[PDB]
Symmetry: D2
Subunit: 328 residues, 4 copies
Amino acid sequence: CTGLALETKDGLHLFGRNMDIEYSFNQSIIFIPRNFKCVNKSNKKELTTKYAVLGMGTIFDDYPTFADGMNEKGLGCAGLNFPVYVSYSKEDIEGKTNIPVYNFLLWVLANFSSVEEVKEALKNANIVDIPISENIPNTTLHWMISDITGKSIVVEQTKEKLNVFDNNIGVLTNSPTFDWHVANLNQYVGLRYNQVPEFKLGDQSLTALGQGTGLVGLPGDFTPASRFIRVAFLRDAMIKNDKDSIDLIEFFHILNNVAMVRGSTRTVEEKSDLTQYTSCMCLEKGIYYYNTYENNQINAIDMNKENLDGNEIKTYKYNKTLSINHVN
Amino acid sequence: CTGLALETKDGLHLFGRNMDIEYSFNQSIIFIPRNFKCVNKSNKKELTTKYAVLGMGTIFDDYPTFADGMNEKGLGCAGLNFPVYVSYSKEDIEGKTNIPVYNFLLWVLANFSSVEEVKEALKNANIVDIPISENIPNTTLHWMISDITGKSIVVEQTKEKLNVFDNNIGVLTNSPTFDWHVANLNQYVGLRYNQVPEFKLGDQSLTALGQGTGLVGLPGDFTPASRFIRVAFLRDAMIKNDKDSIDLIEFFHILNNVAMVRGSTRTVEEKSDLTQYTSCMCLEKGIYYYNTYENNQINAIDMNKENLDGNEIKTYKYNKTLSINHVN
Amino acid sequence: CTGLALETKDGLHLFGRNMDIEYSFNQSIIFIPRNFKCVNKSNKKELTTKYAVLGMGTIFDDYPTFADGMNEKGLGCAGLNFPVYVSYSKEDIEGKTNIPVYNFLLWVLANFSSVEEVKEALKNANIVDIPISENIPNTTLHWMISDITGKSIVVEQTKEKLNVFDNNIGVLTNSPTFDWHVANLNQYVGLRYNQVPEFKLGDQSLTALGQGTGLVGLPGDFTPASRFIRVAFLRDAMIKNDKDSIDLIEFFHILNNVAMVRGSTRTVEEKSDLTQYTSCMCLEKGIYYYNTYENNQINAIDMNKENLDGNEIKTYKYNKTLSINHVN
Amino acid sequence: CTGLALETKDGLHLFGRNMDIEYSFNQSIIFIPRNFKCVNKSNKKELTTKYAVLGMGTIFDDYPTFADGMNEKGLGCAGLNFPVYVSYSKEDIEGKTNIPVYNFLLWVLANFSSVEEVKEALKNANIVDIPISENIPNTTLHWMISDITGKSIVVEQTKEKLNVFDNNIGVLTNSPTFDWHVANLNQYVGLRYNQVPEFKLGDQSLTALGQGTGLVGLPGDFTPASRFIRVAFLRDAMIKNDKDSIDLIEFFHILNNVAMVRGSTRTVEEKSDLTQYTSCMCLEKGIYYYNTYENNQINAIDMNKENLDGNEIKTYKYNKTLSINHVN
């Protein structure tokens, strides 16, 4: 998975992610109106939304759970794989605000209007364990969260504490911890976006064979560490050189560079790990844009076209049928 | 630029390319019916098409010139930048079939039905450069040529001779020469598509942080050499692991990985080098598919929907306006 | 700087380091007998050695300070540059065992006989600030420490606490923190010491051009991170494949690979950063071996040839005159 | 293998090599006086030296054969492995000066006084392989040739012709061909010897963790291609930044960086590929300096201390016993 936040030329804030998995999870686009009571049947825990919510997720026994999404106030959240350095509690911890893993994303979007508000409540940070239905393998996720102010945070629970990092890079991938990746960026201070055309190697003239010589040493593989480096510098270069050109499609160009391709990232179970979908949320406008591995045309779902005071959850079918424009 | 040939799960042959430039060249989709006389006004040289032609190009003084394209027989050709090791003749060479740089692509598609037929004629093709209008020369462009048999060749003119290479890799980028890139592939025999989960480092247990550890060492920059390596192995992995899944969208996933992003590949004139468009030709079906930097939705132009015995050149506007599917 | 611990074929333990600096620090080999009172004149703080000490250091106002060294019990310690993530206290902290930076190395060797003994006292870990003479810029260092049991630790003081890590890698370099480097090792689980001779790239046969294809992707620069990776895997390969060949010279072969060469690592003050010397201590034998940038012949100083019950500090001149064997 | 030419601060020319093999070849230092008749007993071919010769080699049936060496005029030659792209003739070619593989090195040094003189004679050197005894062929070895003018050439026989390249890089390794490596150097024009201390990544300050950030992207493995890149740039940096510091030991520092270490470069027969010895010839002085994997102290054999008009071949035992300076 790769997360990304970006500000457009018109001053709008985009937030989204690549979902990188080798399987389907019965996902669909889920809309939840405000003042809507969600009740988990397996453990009888309930949640009533304060704000309307839209994003990608799935439904277990009528209970919604999200992979990423936004609310009507322009707060966004995305849950990304975090397999090694995560540690949830096996049961509730006394005195803490205990949040079940599966419910964290909805908890953020349903209750809060800004990053600053989320930050105070997370101090409170508790990604313990709790199921949802009857079974299911409750995993992990390393959190961020972004809003209309342009500020982003990353949320990671380790064995010692629930960590909340200010994210000044504007990106996230997977393991290891966020502070590891930030220090790793320092290894690449020698990268240059500008062409290096020549090098006088004593008696030998060295001339660049093509464009791109300044970035030689950029890692090309699909590990979380390498993808973090690539997206961080690609984002930086566009802001530095092309702040006034940034729009929706640029978000997709950045994430395409770190997208997984069929065949080349094989798991030990011999399945292909893919970038299954790419989402981009325009936070001010309440529009969830996404495309999929099967269909690259961007699909838009606008929450403002729904009844925010409605009484039903609405779902939209995950689009995996390629849409072509037939010109003649 | 990056060229690619691929065979689908249904046994159809795809051939296409990324066009990587920092400027516009007034390009449009050009269709030319068969038995059509093209006359260059500047030098009075004429060409009558034997086969109907479709592809991307531009028109100078009513004379068409192509960047890539296909013919009705399922022969495809693409012209890619080749700035360093190219050497055209300044005037015609005696006894040779002299082809002007700008006219090479049309010469291939208008006259021949297969790679084998092109191969025999090329034994002799002096790229003596000579304008066709005004004083705007040609390109460093090297040509990849492929057909419905699945076979591809690479054409490169050096100071010594016109080289025609059999292409068993299925890809092409830019400089240096084709034999250089093929030998460079040998440096990467240690790459693995399968996950390496652990490594016992004596008293220390090393465990993979995420998927993709087998491809560590893959170069991530946007130079011609690095892009050649990436596309060669990504193509190999999909054929080896997912031969029966290969379809149209897979072609685009491969080329997306080596696409240039705004801001990060800057020329010495401080302009952003971009992947302006990506074309994919289905050779058996006569369909030219393409998208652009601005609009990622794939557009299809089918030559079989035109009159192949027509008497007019037809053009289609280059689509650079984002096409979104509004779901609700 | 690069630190290294190794066990020989005869079961002896070697511990040493490269010193990588762009300047001289008036270094010499220093021997201190046991029961010897050292008194810092500037701050009147005193230390009486319990064990005899030998190593590289310098003397300020008759007070010895060490860069690396060993004691008569087979305990070794080396102080390596740690510029970014270090944080000493400006004055003594109440209730703690406060150790001045310049005195840490002597404190370890003078007082303790084993890693286990040092570990308990460091819990106690205090690399605060304190001068020595009157001026001088009290720097930082990230600690380890190794003994005759084969076990090593790393000692690093951050803003939060004095960290003591068990070192199962057997190596150390510089910044960032030790836990960062250990996690970074996980990126390289795909490395192979064994030759990969061929790769079937579909229709193209790829054959290795020379030996070493399994390690493609190993970083070649002279940053602390890259040197950590190289030394960790070079050490691992020799233990795995050649445990019974390990002797003195093998230690130097490993460290040579990460040694800095004149001209290629330039500071911002335009000076060349060099591997000024390489030391190797045979802990059971009480012999300090070393060579220098100027003289690669290994020099041996044996503490057992001195009077351990003596009453004088003894010094030996740093050898920077190349020693050649004239055969004829 | 790695070859290197260097000019000292006093204007003297050094020429030498690493020998990288996994076995012993009964090597010794061989001196041959001038006007000495060497006769191969197996094929009755004879050679009378015009100039006295000194270098590393072995003797088969009283016939000497060299791996590297120099003559009394200051001409040097080194034979390096060249396994893939070499092609010797199976028998003599008519009209050519046919040189047996095993005899090439001696042929150069015995007959010629300069690079220019060798160049003219090579216009024609058919490496038709033919034994000189038993059935133990020759090597993939390619030859670097250098003299007191500071000029070097590279000699490579392919299927088409005997190639003689001017060497303006000052280095050589193994396969592929010399022109491949020279073009490969162009990929690394973005390397910098000077420290890059910081990088402003938008809202995030990136600061170098240690020295060496300008060379990130330098390959660290032991393949011929990677070693070529390293030695080329390390040599360049020292000449550019430290021309007036260059002496004998600097030569060894450069070659140490590309030396193979026990355990980490394993062949398919599971043997460790090592840098068995490193030679350095001072061409003006007639001194052959060398050390070995086992003994790093430099040994000097001066041909001017021998009788150049003598009547016997003289040999010196290959030194593989560690020579330590015991200080106390």
